[PDB]
Design a protein around this ligand. Structure first.
Ligand SMILES: [Ca+2]
Ligand SMILES: [Ca+2]
Lengths: 91, 374, 97
C-alpha cells in the first residue's frame, strides 16, 4: 500500500492541496467561536440586501476561445510533426 | 480620403482606408501606410492573387494554406495583400489573420491583412462615404454569393480602395502591380547603419485567364511567384507544364481549352498562350507549393525568395532579408545550402546584424553558421 | 481487342498484392474513371471504400482533382462513415466539402 501511494505521492498531495485551499477560500475569515460574528454579518447582509468561476464579457470570452483553439492547433501540429519524425514512421 | 470604418456584426472591428485613383503614385500610398497609419516597414510581403472565382478551394486545402501563411507570417512583421472583399480565400485568410491577432500575446511583430479592392465592387460604399474623423463610418457585414459586388472584409485592418479608371477598366491590377513593385524597391533601415530590402512574393491560387497580363507584369518586375499545386485553374496548368518540363503552343492551348471550356477566341487564346509561354520562359521566378509533398510553406517561400535573389545578383547585401527570414524560420539547412554557398561572398561586417538577431532570438544553429562563415 | 481495352483489366498477384479488396476497389475505380467524371457514379465505389477502410485509395483516386464533389453528394456516405465508425473517412469527407 505504501509503495503504491508513494509512487503517486505528488499527484495525491496536489489534489489534497487543491481541496484544502478551496475549502479555506470559501470559509468565513473568523475562527470559531468568533465565527458567530461572521455568521451574523452574513445573515444581516442577506436580510437587508469570485476568484474562481467568473463570467467574462462576450468579446473577452470569444478572444479566449479563439486563443485556446489556436493553442490546440499548435499542440496537434507539434504532435503530428513528432509522429512524422519517429523511427517507426520513418521505417 | 482618409477614413475609419466601424464594422458592425459578429465582432466590433475597426478599419482604416484611403480612396485612390489609377494615376496615384504608389510612393504616396506607401508613405501613408507607413507614417500616416503606423505600419512598420514589413519584413515580408505576400500578395494573394486569384481565389476570387466561383470554384473555391477544398476545406483541407484552404485551411492548410491559410494556417501555413499565417504561421509563416507570425515570426516577423508581414503584410498579406488581398482583395479585401468578404468572399473566397480572402475571407478565410482574413479570418486566420484575425484569429492569430486574438491569440497573439506579442504585439511587437504584427501580421497585417491589407486589402486592395475596387471601389465599384464594395457593397454600401455610400454608407462608408461619410468617414467623419470624429465618427468612423459604420459598415454592415453581409455574406453574399459569387455575384459581382461584395462587402469589405471585417477582418482586414487596412484598405486601399482604388477608383475605376475611365481609360481602361483594369485599375485594380495595375495598382496592385505598382504597389508590389514600389514595395520591392523599398529599403528599410536595418539595425545600426544598415538597410535591407523587403521580400515580396506573389501567391497564386486558381487563376483565371484574365490575370495573366498582371501575372506577367509582376514577373517582369522581378517579383517571385508561388503557385498552389491543386488550386484549381491556371495554377494546375502551370504546375502540369512544369511537370512535363516542356511547353509548346499545342500543349498550352490544349490545357487552356481543357481547363477553361468557356474561353473560345483565336486572338484571346493566342494572347494567353504567349503570356503563359513567357511566364514559364522566366521560370526562376516561379515555384510550386504542393501541400501533399512540401507541407511547409515557410520552406517553399524561402526557397523561392532565395532563387529569385540568386538569379538577380550575387552581392551579400541583397541576401540580408532572405537571411533574416531564414533565421526567423530556423531554416539553417536552406541557408547553408543556398545563402552561404561559394556563389555569394560573405564578410564579417555583413553578418554583424544577423549575428545579433540570431543571438537575441536564441538561434544557436545560425550563431554557429555565422561563426563558421567569417 | 481484350488487351486493347486495357483499362477494364486488372491483375491480382497474391504474392505481391495479397489484399483482394484493394485490387477490387482499384479495378472498379479505374473502370469508373475511364467511364465518367460525375461524382454520382463514384458513390458505390466510395461506399465500398468506406466499408473496406481504404482511405488511401479513396483519397488518391476518388477524391482527386478529376472528380468534383459537392456537399450534398457526400451526405449519405458521411452518415455511413459516422454510423459504421470510420473516423478517417469522416475526416476525409469534412476535408472534401
Ligand atoms: Ca533580397
Ligand atoms: Ca460506379
Amino acid at each position: 500500500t505504501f509503495q503504491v501511494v508513494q509512487e503517486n505521492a505528488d499527484i495525491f498531495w496536489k489534489f489534497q492541496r487543491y481541496n484544502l485551499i478551496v475549502e479555506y477560500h470559501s470559509r468565513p475569515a473568523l475562527a470559531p467561536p468568533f465565527i458567530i460574528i461572521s455568521h451574523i454579518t452574513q445573515a444581516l447582509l442577506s436580510f437587508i440586501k469570485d476568484l474562481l468561476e467568473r463570467e467574462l464579457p462576450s468579446g473577452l470570452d470569444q478572444k479566449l476561445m479563439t486563443w485556446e483553439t489556436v493553442q490546440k492547433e499548435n499542440y496537434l501540429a507539434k504532435l503530428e510533426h513528432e509522429h512524422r519524425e519517429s523511427s517507426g514512421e520513418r521505417l | 480620403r482618409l477614413g475609419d470604418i466601424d464594422f458592425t456584426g459578429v465582432s466590433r472591428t475597426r478599419g482604416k482606408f484611403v480612396r485612390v485613383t489609377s494615376s496615384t503614385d504608389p510612393a504616396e500610398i506607401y508613405q501613408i501606410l507607413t507614417k500616416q497609419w503606423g505600419l512598420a516597414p514589413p519584413h515580408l510581403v505576400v500578395a494573394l492573387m486569384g481565389g476570387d472565382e466561383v470554384a473555391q478551394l477544398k476545406p483541407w486545402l484552404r485551411d492548410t494554406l491559410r494556417k501555413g501563411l499565417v504561421k509563416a507570417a507570425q515570426s516577423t512583421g508581414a503584410w498579406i495583400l488581398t482583395s479585401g472583399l468578404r468572399f473566397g480565400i480572402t475571407k478565410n485568410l482574413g479570418q486566420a489573420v484575425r484569429d492569430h491577432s486574438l491569440a497573439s500575446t506579442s504585439p511587437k511583430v504584427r501580421v497585417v491583412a491589407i486589402g486592395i479592392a475596387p471601389w465599384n465592387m464594395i457593397q454600401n460604399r455610400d454608407l462608408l462615404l461619410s468617414a467623419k474623423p470624429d465618427h468612423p463610418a459604420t459598415y454592415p457585414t453581409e455574406d453574399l454569393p459569387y455575384g459581382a459586388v461584395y462587402s469589405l472584409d471585417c477582418n482586414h485592418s487596412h484598405f486601399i480602395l482604388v477608383d475605376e479608371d475611365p481609360k481602361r477598366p483594369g485599375a485594380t491590377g495595375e495598382m496592385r502591380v505598382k504597389m508590389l513593385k514600389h514595395i520591392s524597391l523599398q529599403r528599410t533601415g536595418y539595425g545600426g547603419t544598415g538597410s535591407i530590402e523587403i521580400p515580396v512574393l506573389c501567391l497564386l491560387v486558381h487563376g483565371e485567364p484574365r490575370i495573366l497580363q498582371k501575372m506577367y507584369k509582376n514577373i517582369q518586375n522581378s517579383i517571385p511567384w508561388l503557385i498552389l499545386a491543386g488550386s484549381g485553374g491556371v495554377a494546375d496548368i502551370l504546375v502540369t507544364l512544369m511537370d512535363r518540363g516542356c511547353w509548346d503552343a499545342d500543349i498550352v492551348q490544349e490545357l487552356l481549352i481543357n481547363t477553361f471550356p468557356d474561353g473560345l477566341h483565336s486572338t484571346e487564346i493566342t494572347s494567353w498562350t504567349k503570356l503563359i509561354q513567357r511566364i514559364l520562359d522566366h521560370g526562376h521566378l516561379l515555384t510550386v507549393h504542393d501541400p501533399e509533398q512540401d507541407s511547409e510553406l515557410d520552406t517553399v517561400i524561402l526557397k523561392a525568395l532565395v532563387k529569385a535573389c540568386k538569379s538577380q545578383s550575387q552581392e551579400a547585401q541583397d541576401f540580408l532579408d532572405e537571411l533574416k527570414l531564414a533565421v526567423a524560420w530556423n531554416r539553417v539547412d536552406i541557408a547553408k545550402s543556398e545563402i552561404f554557398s561559394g556563389d555569394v561572398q560573405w564578410s564579417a561586417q555583413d553578418l554583424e546584424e544577423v549575428m545579433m538577431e540570431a543571438l537575441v532570438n536564441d538561434k544557436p544553429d545560425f550563431v554557429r553558421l555565422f561563426v563558421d562563415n567569417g
